Design a protein around this ligand. Sequence first.
Ligand SMILES: NC(=O)c1ccc[n+]([C@@H]2O[C@H](COP(=O)([O-])OP(=O)(O)OC[C@H]3O[C@@H](n4cnc5c(N)ncnc54)[C@H](O)[C@@H]3O)[C@@H](O)[C@H]2O)c1
Length: 162
Amino acid sequence: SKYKHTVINNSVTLVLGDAIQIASLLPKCILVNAANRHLKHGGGIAGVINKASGGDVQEESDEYISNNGPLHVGDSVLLKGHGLADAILHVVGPDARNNEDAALLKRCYKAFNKHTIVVTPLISAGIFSVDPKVSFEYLLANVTTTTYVVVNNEDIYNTLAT
Ligand SMILES: NC(=O)c1ccc[n+]([C@@H]2O[C@H](COP(=O)([O-])OP(=O)(O)OC[C@H]3O[C@@H](n4cnc5c(N)ncnc54)[C@H](O)[C@@H]3O)[C@@H](O)[C@H]2O)c1
């Protein structure tokens, strides 16, 4: 403890708190960023990750994109951790505002499985406007590695913890 949490299965623990704070706690982990195709970290969790790095994350992201072009929806890229974690896995969830289908979360969450310990927000559950329950279902269905799923909204936590 130290945070409110529910163990869902052998792999997944749901945590009420801040993903950055949970990632700092763990000696070894990857932190997941809920990113857009251009890795422009203007807001949401992406914004808070970038600011916690003092803009180091945006700097790196720009270099990656500048040289490699935009990601596809459902793609991910493992980049440096900038002291927040061992590395940051930037994952591009579907944006329901752009009629992108929630089923692309399968690709997002499968990318977790090659990592030993993952700390993640619910992908697409913010401004990308996927039902948190739907995002969580896709996570449980596809994630097979040790994962701390961190939500900062107690009402969302209660819904998913039932
Ligand atoms: N031009 C641009 O900058 C541009 C354009 C289009 C889209 N977008 C991006 O789309 C992104 C992704 O949307 P999304 O829904 O996948 O992301 P998200 O940040 O919006 O939401 C993910 C979930 O995690 C929660 N959360 C937020 N901060 C948290 C924290 N500290 N710890 C744990 N949980 C936290 C949110 O409340 C939400 O439930 C935006 O953050 C933004 O970067 C940006």
